[PDB]
Amino acid sequence: LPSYVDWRSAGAVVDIKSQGECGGCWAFSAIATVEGINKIVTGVLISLSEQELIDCGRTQNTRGCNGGYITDGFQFIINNGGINTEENYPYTAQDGECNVDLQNEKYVTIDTYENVPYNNEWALQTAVTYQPVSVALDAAGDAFKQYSSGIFTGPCGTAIDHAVTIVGYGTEGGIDYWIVKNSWDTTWGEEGYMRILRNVGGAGTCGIATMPSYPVKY
Ligand SMILES: *[C@@H](C(=O)O)[C@H](O)C(=O)N[C@@H](CC(C)C)C(=O)NCCCCNC(N)=[NH2+]
């Protein structure tokens, strides 16, 4: 595997987005990795609609701004036969009525998704080498919420509550890290991104390695 991977150097990461007060992080994470794999196999980076997942993708315990699961975001794109763009179905940070004309207008498709073996940072590094991967972490603490710069080491638990996207990894000064794309605008962290301690064992720092998944497009 490479010593460093950064999907932003390959044109596979859309600029930082802002979810606001709506609890739609599951939709932001699912969309960022579908944007990623679409660029890798089709060669064109298109920004996609989180709002379509929030409005049209309600199922079981995925309930729009009320929270949900990354994999239900991928399963909506699979069952719908595709997803529309951010410009065609823009984000309102609201639970809204599914716009059926916009739901039927599809520009990007995926075929299936896979789960990375949980609590296995080596298998997670292998998957990130091929594409951005969706993860969730424990973002309930003030240290996480107030993060500004550096390689974050904690404190944080592992009972995850906030989905984000890993867009790379590297090492600086002998310290290994993951590069994380968050959805709290460019005013949080390193212009919207976080570097977080890698190779710590088990579930990873703030549980980042405990439930990774990614979309598959043949
Ligand atoms: C994350 C955010 O917007 O900050 C958002 O709260 C969220 O969806 N969190 C997920 C985190 C991982 C995907 C596990 C979460 O905790 N989902 C569980 C939501 C259950 C909702 N069920 C009901 N009944 N509202």
Q: From which experimental method does this structure derive? A: X-ray
DSSP letter string, 74-130: HHHHHHHT-B-BTTTS---SS-----HHHHH---B---EEEE--SS-HHHHHHHHHH
- Probe target for ligand 1 pocket from 18, 19, 26, 208, with the most ligand atoms within 8 Å of CB: 26
Q: SS3 of 31, please?
A: helix
Residue 69 alpha carbon, nearest atom of ligand 1: 13
Residue carrying structure tokens 């996480």: 144
The encoded tokens of residue 133 equal: 């991967």
In our burial notation (b when 16+ CB lie closer than 10 A, e otherwise), range 33-61 reads bbbbbbbbeeeeebebbbbbbbbbbbeee
Q: Is 58 a pocket residue for ligand 1 (Cβ < 6 Å)?
A: no
The encoded tokens of residue 42 equal: 């089709």
CA distances from 4 to 37, 115, 154, 172 (A): 19, 22, 22, 10
CATH of the domain at 39: 3.90.70.10
Pairwise CA distance, residues 152 & 178, whole Å = 10
Supply φ then ψ for residue 169, to 5 degrees: -160, 165
Measured in Å, residue 68 CA sits from the centre of ligand 1 at: 4
Pairwise CA distance, residues 152 & 108, whole Å = 34
The number of domains in the chain is 1
Q: Peptide bond preceding 155: is omega within 30 degrees of 0, i.e. cis?
A: yes
Pairing of strands 112-115, 151-152: unpaired
User: 66: domain range?
Assistant: 1-218
The encoded tokens of residue 149 equal: 């710069």
Q: Which residue is closest in CA terms to ligand 1's atom 17?
A: 68
Pairwise CA distance, residues 176 & 3, whole Å = 10
Pairwise CA distance, residues 47 & 200, whole Å = 33
- Residue 38: CA count within 13 A, CB half-sphere: 23
